[PDB]
Amino acid sequence: MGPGFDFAQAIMKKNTVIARTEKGEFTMLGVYDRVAVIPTHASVGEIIYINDVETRVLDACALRDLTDTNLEITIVKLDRNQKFRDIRHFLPRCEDDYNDAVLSVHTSKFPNMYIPVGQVTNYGFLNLGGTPTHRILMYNFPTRAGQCGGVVTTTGKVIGIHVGGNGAQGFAAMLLHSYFT
Secondary structure (H helix, E strand, O other): OOHHHHHHHHHHHHHEEEEEEOOEEEEEEEEEEOEEEEEHHHOOOOEEEEOOEEEEEEEEEEEEOOOOOEEEEEEEEEOOOOOEOOOHHHOOOOOOOEEEEEEEEOOOOOOOEEEEEEEEEEEEEEEEOOEEEEEEEEEOOOOOOOOOOOEEEEOOEEEEEEEEEOOOOEEEEEOOHHHHO
């Protein structure tokens, strides 16, 4: 509908796949080469389904900060025959707050879904499902089951992936450029 939705669509149309684990179907962001991200609660194993095709997992790393605190991001290298468009230049370098973000989801349950979530707070610490988590972004939208892995964007930046909510707020894990050197 406007330039925020334009940037979000451009990311969804080229840099997402549908990932299925034993814990559900997730929006999965491809970042560069065969490297993608997914919420750590997806419990990625040795095999994952990518657009309903059986795919070997070459590597999976559940990120933690240097205090050994959960970040809720798993970086996955896929045994896929095709590379993603490199979007690392759209990743922020530092923790920040944002205006006018969009959350975009693409699954069997929610195809072509886009949500203007408004202002995004650097929330920091969250007890996420009982697990102490750092580098959390918050937005005041009543996000639902089926939105985990959703991509959070502003114009020109890919800033996080949706990892949870409390019924009134939604929470995303930050993406930082330094995760993908």
